[PDB]
């Protein structure tokens, strides 16, 4: 193990952000080695006094050192530090205890070949791609480095959330490319593309039973997320994907948050918030919950039965907020069955407590589908 090159080491995390480093180091003396992207130097990061401390690994004459003896490799230096329990510096008194290994999701850049751009996300371009070992087709999310540091720190959040999930109607994570820059999140490629485009393109061809089945799939995904205490915050037709077999999967988890007690209080600082899909209390007071996702689901129902129409077309975001406060809601689409519209109206109840649960939504849609 110690003989292996640094890049192969389990405790070498390459280009992971400082914010990810803080997540990984749990106990005193927990440590990892990484490459500092800015300075192009290796860094030993260690938890001491409750906070990560970052030591620059010096290199001279092909020997790696801190303030003591030098070694011909960084793994030999780490082994010396761990085995002797010598403080990394006399001044700091930091002593290594446990090497924090990469998880199973970390992926090498070499494993992946990037293809054509397939869309644009808030963090940057999404590309199609290929895993070289088996020809598995993937979607690859990128993060533009010119984004503000506060926001870039949020990019890996979607991967951290999705690592936990497995469901037929939730997009599947494949891995995270964080050993070098540029950083990528890698997911299964969903062949049919986004649901909004599907609705607009397939259009008059789609049967009501088919639409009910697809939104039923979305309700199943949302029920599963609610069960995991996940609040998606960006549910919309454009953020649902369609498989080659017309199964719908929820995707685009960049804004999603896990809250044990069911409420996420927004920073207030979000840019490009999808105002037309967002519940009033979430905009007004920053209160996000499964109930605010339910409001979004009502908009998704509207998008589905209007075959991809844009909501509140004649209103600005601010005008939409004012319109909704006055009791305004979207009109019933022609193709929308009366029962679906009644459910849609319940989803848009002003008080979040009055809105139906995702289980109720799934069951009601399923029951409607059986008579269509
Ligand atoms: C011509 C067709 C077009 N296709 C096509 C067209 C649109 C989207 C996608 N796919 C994905 N889009 C995502 N975000 C998009 C951002 C921009 C708006 C739409 C989406 N919201 C995400 C995310 N997060 C994912 C995540 N995981 N997996 C995916 O596939 C995926 C494929 C692929 C197909 C093979 O070629």
Coordinates of C-alpha atoms and ligand atoms in Angstrom, one line a residue:
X1 CA 0.0 0.0 0.0
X2 CA 2.7 2.5 1.0
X3 CA 4.7 1.5 -2.1
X4 CA 1.7 2.7 -4.4
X5 CA 1.8 6.1 -6.1
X6 CA 0.0 8.9 -4.3
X7 CA -2.8 9.0 -6.9
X8 CA -3.8 5.4 -6.1
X9 CA -3.8 6.0 -2.3
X10 CA -7.2 5.6 -0.6
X11 CA -6.6 8.7 1.5
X12 CA -5.7 10.9 -1.4
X13 CA -8.7 13.0 -2.4
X14 CA -7.1 15.2 -5.1
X15 CA -9.2 18.2 -6.0
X16 CA -11.9 18.1 -3.4
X17 CA -13.1 21.5 -2.1
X18 CA -12.2 22.8 1.4
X19 CA -15.9 22.5 2.2
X20 CA -16.0 18.8 1.3
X21 CA -12.8 18.4 3.4
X22 CA -14.7 19.7 6.5
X23 CA -17.5 17.2 5.9
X24 CA -15.0 14.2 5.7
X25 CA -12.9 15.0 8.8
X26 CA -15.0 13.9 11.8
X27 CA -12.7 13.0 14.7
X28 CA -9.5 14.5 16.1
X29 CA -6.5 13.4 14.0
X30 CA -8.7 12.4 11.1
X31 CA -6.7 13.3 7.9
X32 CA -6.5 13.3 4.2
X33 CA -4.1 14.5 1.5
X34 CA -5.3 16.6 -1.4
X35 CA -3.9 18.9 -4.1
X36 CA -4.4 22.6 -3.5
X37 CA -6.0 23.7 -6.8
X38 CA -4.8 27.3 -6.4
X39 CA -1.2 26.8 -5.4
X40 CA -0.5 23.5 -7.2
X41 CA 1.0 22.0 -4.0
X42 CA 0.0 19.0 -1.9
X43 CA -1.8 19.6 1.3
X44 CA -2.2 17.5 4.4
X45 CA -5.6 18.3 6.0
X46 CA -6.2 17.3 9.6
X47 CA -9.0 17.8 12.2
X48 CA -7.6 19.4 15.4
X49 CA -9.5 21.4 18.0
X50 CA -12.7 20.8 16.0
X51 CA -11.5 22.5 12.8
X52 CA -9.5 21.3 9.7
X53 CA -5.9 22.5 9.7
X54 CA -4.1 22.6 6.4
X55 CA -0.4 21.9 6.1
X56 CA 1.5 22.5 2.9
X57 CA 3.7 19.5 2.2
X58 CA 7.2 20.9 1.2
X59 CA 9.2 19.3 -1.5
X60 CA 13.0 19.6 -2.1
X61 CA 15.5 17.3 -3.9
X62 CA 12.5 15.0 -4.6
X63 CA 12.0 14.6 -0.9
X64 CA 8.7 15.4 0.9
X65 CA 8.6 16.9 4.4
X66 CA 7.0 19.2 6.8
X67 CA 9.4 20.5 9.4
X68 CA 11.3 17.2 10.1
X69 CA 12.8 14.4 8.0
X70 CA 12.1 14.2 4.3
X71 CA 10.8 11.1 2.5
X72 CA 11.0 10.0 -1.2
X73 CA 7.2 9.8 -1.4
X74 CA 4.2 11.4 0.3
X75 CA 2.9 8.0 1.4
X76 CA 6.2 7.3 3.1
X77 CA 5.9 10.7 4.9
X78 CA 2.4 9.9 6.0
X79 CA 3.4 6.5 7.3
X80 CA 6.3 8.1 9.3
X81 CA 3.9 10.7 10.8
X82 CA 1.2 8.1 11.7
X83 CA 3.7 5.5 13.0
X84 CA 5.8 7.9 15.1
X85 CA 2.9 10.1 16.3
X86 CA 5.2 13.1 15.8
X87 CA 3.5 16.4 15.7
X88 CA 3.3 17.8 12.2
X89 CA 4.9 21.0 13.5
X90 CA 6.2 21.7 17.0
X91 CA 4.2 24.9 17.1
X92 CA 0.9 23.3 16.1
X93 CA 1.1 20.0 18.0
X94 CA -1.2 18.3 15.5
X95 CA -0.8 14.5 15.4
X96 CA -2.3 12.1 12.8
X97 CA -4.7 9.5 14.0
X98 CA -6.8 8.1 11.2
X99 CA -6.7 8.2 7.4
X100 CA -10.1 9.1 5.8
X101 CA -10.6 7.0 2.7
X102 CA -12.4 8.0 -0.5
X103 CA -16.0 6.6 -0.7
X104 CA -17.1 4.2 -3.5
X105 CA -18.5 7.1 -5.5
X106 CA -15.2 8.7 -6.4
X107 CA -14.4 8.2 -10.1
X108 CA -11.2 8.7 -12.1
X109 CA -11.2 11.2 -14.9
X110 CA -9.6 8.5 -17.0
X111 CA -12.7 6.3 -16.7
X112 CA -14.8 9.0 -18.5
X113 CA -15.0 10.4 -22.0
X114 CA -16.9 13.6 -22.4
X115 CA -19.4 13.9 -25.3
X116 CA -21.6 16.7 -26.7
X117 CA -23.3 19.3 -24.5
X118 CA -26.9 18.3 -23.8
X119 CA -28.1 21.2 -21.6
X120 CA -27.2 24.1 -19.4
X121 CA -27.6 24.0 -15.6
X122 CA -27.2 26.8 -13.1
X123 CA -23.7 25.6 -12.3
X124 CA -22.7 25.1 -15.9
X125 CA -23.1 22.8 -18.9
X126 CA -24.4 19.3 -18.8
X127 CA -22.8 16.9 -21.2
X128 CA -23.5 13.4 -22.5
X129 CA -20.6 11.0 -21.9
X130 CA -19.3 7.5 -21.9
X131 CA -17.8 5.3 -19.2
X132 CA -14.8 3.7 -21.0
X133 CA -14.8 0.3 -19.3
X134 CA -18.3 -0.8 -20.4
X135 CA -19.8 1.8 -22.7
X136 CA -22.3 2.9 -20.1
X137 CA -23.8 6.2 -21.3
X138 CA -23.8 9.0 -18.7
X139 CA -24.8 12.6 -18.1
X140 CA -21.9 14.8 -16.8
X141 CA -22.6 18.0 -14.8
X142 CA -19.9 20.7 -14.8
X143 CA -19.3 23.7 -12.5
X144 CA -18.0 27.0 -13.9
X145 CA -15.0 28.2 -11.8
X146 CA -15.9 31.9 -12.2
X147 CA -19.0 31.4 -10.0
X148 CA -18.9 33.0 -6.5
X149 CA -17.1 30.8 -4.0
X150 CA -20.2 30.5 -1.8
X151 CA -22.3 29.0 -4.6
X152 CA -19.5 26.7 -6.0
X153 CA -19.3 25.1 -2.5
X154 CA -22.9 24.0 -3.1
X155 CA -22.2 22.1 -6.3
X156 CA -21.3 18.7 -4.7
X157 CA -24.4 18.9 -2.6
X158 CA -26.5 17.2 -5.3
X159 CA -24.1 14.2 -5.3
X160 CA -24.0 14.0 -1.5
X161 CA -27.8 13.8 -1.5
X162 CA -28.2 11.4 -4.4
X163 CA -25.6 8.9 -3.0
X164 CA -28.3 7.8 -0.5
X165 CA -31.1 7.3 -2.9
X166 CA -32.3 4.4 -5.0
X167 CA -35.8 4.6 -6.7
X168 CA -37.3 3.9 -10.1
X169 CA -38.5 7.5 -10.4
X170 CA -35.3 9.3 -9.2
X171 CA -32.3 9.8 -11.4
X172 CA -29.4 7.6 -10.5
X173 CA -26.0 8.9 -9.5
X174 CA -23.0 7.0 -11.0
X175 CA -20.0 8.9 -9.5
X176 CA -18.2 12.0 -8.8
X177 CA -15.0 13.1 -10.5
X178 CA -13.1 15.0 -7.8
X179 CA -9.5 13.6 -8.1
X180 CA -8.6 16.4 -10.5
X181 CA -10.2 19.6 -11.9
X182 CA -12.5 20.2 -13.6
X183 CA -14.9 18.6 -11.1
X184 CA -17.8 16.6 -12.5
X185 CA -20.9 14.8 -11.2
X186 CA -21.7 11.7 -13.3
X187 CA -25.2 10.3 -13.6
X188 CA -27.1 7.8 -15.7
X189 CA -28.0 9.3 -19.0
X190 CA -31.7 9.5 -19.5
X191 CA -32.3 8.8 -23.2
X192 CA -35.6 10.6 -23.8
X193 CA -34.4 14.0 -22.4
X194 CA -36.4 16.4 -20.3
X195 CA -40.2 16.1 -19.8
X196 CA -41.0 19.6 -20.9
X197 CA -39.4 19.1 -24.3
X198 CA -41.1 15.7 -24.5
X199 CA -44.6 17.2 -23.9
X200 CA -44.0 20.0 -26.4
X201 CA -42.6 17.7 -29.1
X202 CA -44.9 14.6 -28.6
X203 CA -47.9 16.8 -27.9
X204 CA -51.2 15.8 -29.7
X205 CA -49.9 12.3 -29.9
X206 CA -50.0 11.7 -26.1
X207 CA -53.0 10.0 -24.6
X208 CA -54.5 11.2 -21.3
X209 CA -53.7 7.7 -19.8
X210 CA -50.1 8.1 -20.8
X211 CA -49.9 11.6 -19.2
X212 CA -51.5 10.3 -16.0
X213 CA -49.0 7.5 -15.8
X214 CA -46.0 9.9 -16.2
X215 CA -47.2 12.3 -13.5
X216 CA -48.0 9.2 -11.4
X217 CA -44.3 8.4 -11.8
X218 CA -43.4 11.9 -10.6
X219 CA -45.7 11.5 -7.6
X220 CA -44.0 8.2 -6.7
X221 CA -40.5 9.8 -6.9
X222 CA -41.7 12.7 -4.7
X223 CA -43.3 10.4 -2.2
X224 CA -40.0 8.6 -1.9
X225 CA -38.1 11.9 -1.4
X226 CA -40.5 13.0 1.3
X227 CA -39.8 9.6 3.0
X228 CA -36.1 10.5 3.0
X229 CA -36.8 14.0 4.4
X230 CA -35.6 15.5 1.1
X231 CA -37.1 18.8 -0.1
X232 CA -36.3 19.2 -3.8
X233 CA -37.2 22.9 -4.2
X234 CA -37.0 22.9 -8.1
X235 CA -39.7 20.5 -9.3
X236 CA -40.9 21.3 -12.8
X237 CA -41.4 19.6 -16.1
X238 CA -38.0 20.8 -17.3
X239 CA -36.5 19.0 -14.3
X240 CA -38.1 15.6 -15.0
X241 CA -36.5 13.2 -17.5
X242 CA -38.1 10.6 -19.8
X243 CA -36.6 7.1 -20.3
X244 CA -36.8 5.3 -23.6
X245 CA -39.8 3.5 -22.2
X246 CA -41.7 6.7 -21.1
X247 CA -40.9 6.3 -17.4
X248 CA -40.4 9.6 -15.7
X249 CA -37.5 10.3 -13.3
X250 CA -37.0 13.4 -11.1
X251 CA -33.6 15.0 -11.7
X252 CA -31.7 18.3 -11.0
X253 CA -31.2 18.1 -7.3
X254 CA -28.8 21.1 -7.0
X255 CA -31.3 23.1 -4.8
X256 CA -32.5 20.1 -2.8
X257 CA -32.0 20.0 1.0
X258 CA -32.4 17.2 3.6
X259 CA -34.2 18.3 6.8
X260 CA -35.0 15.9 9.6
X261 CA -37.8 18.1 10.9
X262 CA -39.3 18.8 7.5
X263 CA -38.5 22.5 7.1
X264 CA -35.6 24.2 5.2
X265 CA -35.1 27.9 6.0
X266 CA -33.7 29.5 2.9
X267 CA -30.7 31.9 3.1
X268 CA -32.8 34.4 1.2
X269 CA -29.8 34.9 -1.2
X270 CA -30.8 32.5 -4.0
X271 CA -30.5 33.8 -7.5
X272 CA -32.7 32.6 -10.4
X273 CA -35.3 31.1 -8.0
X274 CA -38.1 29.5 -10.1
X275 CA -40.7 31.9 -8.8
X276 CA -43.6 30.6 -11.0
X277 CA -43.1 27.0 -9.5
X278 CA -42.5 28.1 -5.9
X279 CA -45.1 28.2 -3.1
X280 CA -46.0 31.6 -1.6
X281 CA -44.6 30.9 2.0
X282 CA -41.2 29.7 0.5
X283 CA -40.9 33.0 -1.4
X284 CA -42.3 35.2 1.4
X285 CA -40.6 33.6 4.4
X286 CA -38.0 31.3 3.0
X287 CA -40.0 28.3 4.2
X288 CA -39.4 25.2 2.1
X289 CA -40.9 21.8 2.9
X290 CA -42.5 18.9 1.2
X291 CA -45.7 21.1 1.2
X292 CA -43.9 23.7 -0.9
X293 CA -42.8 20.8 -3.2
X294 CA -46.5 19.9 -3.4
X295 CA -47.3 23.4 -4.7
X296 CA -44.6 22.8 -7.4
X297 CA -46.2 19.5 -8.2
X298 CA -49.5 21.3 -8.9
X299 CA -47.6 23.5 -11.4
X300 CA -46.1 20.3 -12.9
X301 CA -49.6 18.9 -13.3
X302 CA -50.6 22.1 -15.1
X303 CA -47.6 21.9 -17.4
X304 CA -48.4 18.2 -18.2
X305 CA -52.0 18.7 -19.2
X306 CA -51.4 22.0 -21.0
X307 CA -48.8 19.9 -23.0
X308 CA -45.9 22.1 -21.9
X309 CA -47.5 25.6 -21.9
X310 CA -45.5 28.2 -19.9
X311 CA -47.3 29.2 -16.6
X312 CA -48.4 32.8 -16.0
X313 CA -47.2 33.9 -19.5
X314 CA -48.4 37.4 -19.2
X315 CA -46.9 38.0 -15.7
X316 CA -43.5 38.9 -14.5
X317 CA -42.1 37.0 -11.5
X318 CA -43.2 39.9 -9.1
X319 CA -46.6 40.1 -10.8
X320 CA -47.0 36.4 -10.3
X321 CA -46.3 36.7 -6.6
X322 CA -48.9 39.5 -6.3
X323 CA -51.4 37.7 -8.4
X324 CA -51.1 34.6 -6.2
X325 CA -51.4 36.6 -3.0
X326 CA -54.8 37.9 -4.4
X327 CA -56.0 34.4 -4.9
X328 CA -55.0 34.1 -8.6
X329 CA -54.2 30.6 -9.8
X330 CA -53.6 29.0 -13.2
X331 CA -56.7 28.2 -15.3
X332 CA -57.8 24.6 -16.1
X333 CA -56.2 23.3 -19.3
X334 CA -58.6 21.9 -22.0
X335 CA -57.1 18.4 -21.8
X336 CA -57.1 18.3 -18.0
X337 CA -59.8 16.0 -16.6
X338 CA -62.0 17.7 -13.9
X339 CA -60.6 15.4 -11.2
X340 CA -57.0 16.2 -12.0
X341 CA -57.8 19.9 -11.9
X342 CA -59.5 19.5 -8.5
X343 CA -56.2 17.8 -7.2
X344 CA -54.2 20.6 -8.8
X345 CA -56.3 23.2 -6.9
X346 CA -55.7 21.4 -3.6
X347 CA -51.9 21.4 -4.4
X348 CA -52.2 25.2 -4.7
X349 CA -54.0 25.8 -1.4
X350 CA -52.5 28.9 0.1
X351 CA -51.8 27.4 3.5
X352 CA -49.3 24.6 3.2
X353 CA -51.2 22.5 5.8
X354 CA -54.2 22.3 3.5
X355 CA -52.3 20.8 0.6
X356 CA -52.4 17.0 0.0
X357 CA -49.5 14.7 0.8
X358 CA -47.6 13.0 -2.0
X359 CA -49.1 9.6 -1.1
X360 CA -52.6 11.1 -1.6
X361 CA -51.5 12.7 -4.8
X362 CA -50.0 9.3 -6.1
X363 CA -53.1 7.4 -5.1
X364 CA -55.6 9.9 -6.6
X365 CA -53.7 10.1 -9.9
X366 CA -53.6 6.3 -10.0
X367 CA -57.3 6.0 -9.3
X368 CA -58.0 8.6 -12.0
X369 CA -55.8 6.7 -14.5
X370 CA -57.8 3.5 -14.1
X371 CA -60.9 5.1 -15.5
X372 CA -59.0 6.5 -18.5
Ligands
LIG1 C1 -31.3 14.7 -27.9 C2 -31.3 14.0 -26.5 C3 -31.4 15.1 -25.4 N1 -31.1 14.4 -24.1 C4 -31.3 15.2 -23.0 C5 -31.9 16.5 -23.0 C6 -32.1 17.2 -21.8 C7 -31.6 16.7 -20.6 C8 -31.0 15.4 -20.6 N2 -30.5 14.8 -19.5 C9 -30.2 15.3 -18.2 N3 -30.5 16.6 -18.0 C10 -30.2 17.2 -16.8 N4 -30.5 18.6 -16.6 C11 -31.0 19.3 -17.7 C12 -30.6 20.8 -17.6 C13 -31.1 21.7 -18.7 C14 -32.6 21.5 -18.8 C15 -33.0 20.1 -19.0 C16 -32.5 19.2 -17.8 N5 -33.2 19.7 -16.6 C17 -29.8 16.4 -15.8 C18 -29.6 16.9 -14.4 N6 -29.4 17.3 -13.4 C19 -29.6 15.1 -16.0 C20 -29.1 14.2 -14.8 N7 -28.9 13.0 -15.0 N8 -29.1 12.4 -16.2 C21 -29.6 13.1 -17.4 O1 -29.7 12.5 -18.4 C22 -29.8 14.5 -17.2 C23 -30.9 14.7 -21.8 C24 -30.2 13.3 -24.0 C25 -30.4 12.5 -25.2 C26 -29.5 11.2 -25.2 O2 -30.1 13.3 -26.4

